[PDB]
Design a protein around this motif. Structure first.
Motif, mmCIF file in Angstrom:
data_model
loop_
_atom_site.group_PDB
_atom_site.id
_atom_site.type_symbol
_atom_site.label_atom_id
_atom_site.label_comp_id
_atom_site.label_asym_id
_atom_site.label_seq_id
_atom_site.Cartn_x
_atom_site.Cartn_y
_atom_site.Cartn_z
ATOM 1 N N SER B 39 -7.132 -2.637 7.545
ATOM 2 C CA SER B 39 -6.002 -2.081 6.804
ATOM 3 C C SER B 39 -4.693 -2.725 7.243
ATOM 4 O O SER B 39 -3.871 -3.113 6.405
ATOM 5 C CB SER B 39 -5.951 -0.567 7.006
ATOM 6 O OG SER B 39 -7.107 0.058 6.476
ATOM 7 N N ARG B 40 -4.483 -2.867 8.547
ATOM 8 C CA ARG B 40 -3.246 -3.478 9.026
ATOM 9 C C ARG B 40 -3.188 -4.940 8.596
ATOM 10 O O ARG B 40 -2.125 -5.435 8.201
ATOM 11 C CB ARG B 40 -3.097 -3.314 10.540
ATOM 12 C CG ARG B 40 -3.002 -1.852 10.972
ATOM 13 C CD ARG B 40 -2.363 -1.696 12.349
ATOM 14 N NE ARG B 40 -0.934 -2.018 12.359
ATOM 15 C CZ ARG B 40 0.041 -1.185 11.998
ATOM 16 N NH1 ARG B 40 -0.231 0.046 11.581
ATOM 17 N NH2 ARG B 40 1.300 -1.600 12.015
ATOM 18 N N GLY B 45 -0.961 -8.996 4.876
ATOM 19 C CA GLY B 45 -1.246 -10.058 3.926
ATOM 20 C C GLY B 45 -2.176 -11.129 4.448
ATOM 21 O O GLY B 45 -2.295 -12.194 3.827
ATOM 22 N N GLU B 46 -2.833 -10.878 5.569
ATOM 23 C CA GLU B 46 -3.772 -11.785 6.198
ATOM 24 C C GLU B 46 -5.164 -11.562 5.610
ATOM 25 O O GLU B 46 -5.393 -10.642 4.822
ATOM 26 C CB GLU B 46 -3.771 -11.577 7.711
ATOM 27 C CG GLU B 46 -2.479 -12.015 8.373
ATOM 28 C CD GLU B 46 -2.237 -13.494 8.225
ATOM 29 O OE1 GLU B 46 -3.035 -14.281 8.772
ATOM 30 O OE2 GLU B 46 -1.251 -13.871 7.555
ATOM 31 N N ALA B 47 -6.099 -12.420 5.996
ATOM 32 C CA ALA B 47 -7.475 -12.289 5.530
ATOM 33 C C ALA B 47 -8.223 -11.223 6.326
ATOM 34 O O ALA B 47 -8.289 -11.321 7.558
ATOM 35 C CB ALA B 47 -8.193 -13.622 5.648
#
Lengths: 74, 405, 49
Positions: B39-40, B45-47
């Motif tokens: 979730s974080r 916006g990371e994979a």
């Protein structure tokens, strides 16, 4: 039975074993078995030639000793 | 004590601080924990983390070792403020290969677990052999100078030094990679020895104090020159400079005027004794931005190790020379050596490095043993050797027990 | 999993690991020499294989 103990064996069996020994000896040293040339045998026969040549000289020295007897201090 | 805060590492390198339940079994927390980190990552916006084929999700130490799924987090030696790593570990199950004919089996097996020779290592071997050959060459050339005052020794050694130095220059310029650099370094370092004795052998007449001054002087310069222009192999070059510098001072004094060797040896011992306290300060000051800091850090750690080594070599040579078994109050230098050894033996704990601490501890042990052995050789008698043997065998036995208990 | 005839895994369950027959089909050596006629090295080699 299981081939235990001493016994008798044919010439065909003897060369067969003598071949498997060379093939396995090569594997431990070169890690390959194609044996395009078999250096194991070649290297051994050179030793036989070395020993044989030494004996021939011993026979040579033995004949000279009968042609002209002599002696050395002892 | 109901919960502990720890930092958890997730995919490719994000660190997240979390407060975990200290008594639930670890296997109960790994699933919801994986959801939270994803979730974080999704919000950043990371994979997010995802499974691949066959495997499972695990919680491991930063060293990678996994925690026992059934034990409680408190049951393990995990404390508040520590850090952990969540990871995906792949399946290792697979078919088992077999080969019934023994001869072929030995080759197919043996060729996997061991490394065969190759051209890269081969050059280092040849390079290593030539290095050994020249240090042997200087030895025999040097022995001749001890009985004859002719120019041959300097004449012969000089041409070798030039030739060896010449080859190294080409390799240094042509080098491309670390392997290549190793070859160059070995070649370059091997030139110092012939050049050094080539100079020291030049002064005519019986060999002694005047020749010593030249040798250790040019040696110091040579090591300093290589260190300056190369900037690599710091530890060893540092040591040669230290031992060369201190030896030149003794050589110059003894060459000009000296009432006794004891005076010079005592002076050197005191200089070395105080140098141990200054070593860490000297070392620290002698040394995208992260690259510079990490480079700086290892260079410093390198300097201290070499610095300690240079000092260790000088004290054992001086100490064993001072505690003569016949000269005057024979007991005075023996106990003084004890007090000096006790200081080093205790001081070893002040340094965190494994090799640094070992060399210091060993420096004390080697002095005691070397001193003890000399009393067996000189003033020899059955009592002396018997006592030296008992002392030397018990000595380390007591230390090992004191450290293991 | 689907029951529509073509899925050969329908109704199949894994119970463990073990031995199995490979998908290969071995052809018998033609014109086999009699036991009194067999060479010793190659005989055992083919037997173990």
């Amino acid at each position: 039975g299981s081939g235990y103990g001493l016994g008798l064996s044919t010439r065909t069996q003897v060369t067969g074993y003598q071949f498997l020994a060379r093939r396995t000896a090569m594997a431990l040293t070169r890690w390959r078995v194609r044996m395009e040339i078999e250096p194991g045998r070649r290297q051994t026969l050179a030793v036989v030639a070395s020993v044989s040549a030494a004996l021939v000289i011993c026979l040579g020295a033995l004949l000279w000793s009968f042609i002209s007897p002599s002696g050395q201090l002892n | 004590p109901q919960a502990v805060v720890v930092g958890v590492m997730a995919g490719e390198g994000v660190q997240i601080g979390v407060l975990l339940d200290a008594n639930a079994p670890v296997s109960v927390m790994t699933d919801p924990l994986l959801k939270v980190v994803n979730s974080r990552l999704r919000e950043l916006g990371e994979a997010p983390l995802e499974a691949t084929g066959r495997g499972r999700w695990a919680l491991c130490l930063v060293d990678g070792a996994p925690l026992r799924a059934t034990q409680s987090l408190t049951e393990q030696d995990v404390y508040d403020g520590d850090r952990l790593w969540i990871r995906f570990i792949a399946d290792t199950e697979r078919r088992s290969q077999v080969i019934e004919h023994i001869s072929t089996a030995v080759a197919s097996d043996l060729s996997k677990r061991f490394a065969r020779i190759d051209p890269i290592v081969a050059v280092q071997v040849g390079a290593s052999m030539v290095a050994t050959g020249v240090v042997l060459a200087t030895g025999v050339l040097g022995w001749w100078r001890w009985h004859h005052n002719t120019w041959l020794t300097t004449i012969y050694t000089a041409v070798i030094g030039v030739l060896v130095l010449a080859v190294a220059m080409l390799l240094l310029m042509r080098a491309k990679t670390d392997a290549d650099r190793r070859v160059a370094d070995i070649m370059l370092m091997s030139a110092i020895m012939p050049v050094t004795v080539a100079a020291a052998a030049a002064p005519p007449g019986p060999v002694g104090s005047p020749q010593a001054v030249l040798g250790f002087g040019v040696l110091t310069v040579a090591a300093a020159l290589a260190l300056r222009f190369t900037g690599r192999r710091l530890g060893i070059y540092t040591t040669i400079v230290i031992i060369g510098a201190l030896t030149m001072l003794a050589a110059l004094a003894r060459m000009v005027a000296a009432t006794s060797a004891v005076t010079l040896l005592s002076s050197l011992l005191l200089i070395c004794v105080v140098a141990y306290h200054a070593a860490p300060a000297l070392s620290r000051r002698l040394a995208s931005s992260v690259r510079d800091v990490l480079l700086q850090a290892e260079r410093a750690r390198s300097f201290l190790s070499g610095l300690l080594t240079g000092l260790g070599v000088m004290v054992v040579v001086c100490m064993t020379s001072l505690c003569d078994p016949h000269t005057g109050q024979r007991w005075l230098p023996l106990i003084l050596a004890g007090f000096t050894s006790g200081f080093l033996l205790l001081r070893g704990r002040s340094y965190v490095d494994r090799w640094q601490s070992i060399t210091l501890a060993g420096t004390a042990v080697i002095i005691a043993a070397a001193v003890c052995v000399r009393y067996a050789l000189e003033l020899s008698s059955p009592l002396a050797v018997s006592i030296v043997a008992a002392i030397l065998v018990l000595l380390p036995a007591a230390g090992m027990a004191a450290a293991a208990h | 999993r689907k029951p529509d005839g073509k899925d050969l895994n329908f109704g199949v369950v894994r119970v463990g690991v073990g031995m199995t027959r490979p998908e290969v089909t071995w052809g018998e050596p033609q014109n086999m020499p009699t036991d009194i006629e067999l060479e010793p090295v190659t005989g055992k080699a083919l037997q173990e294989f």
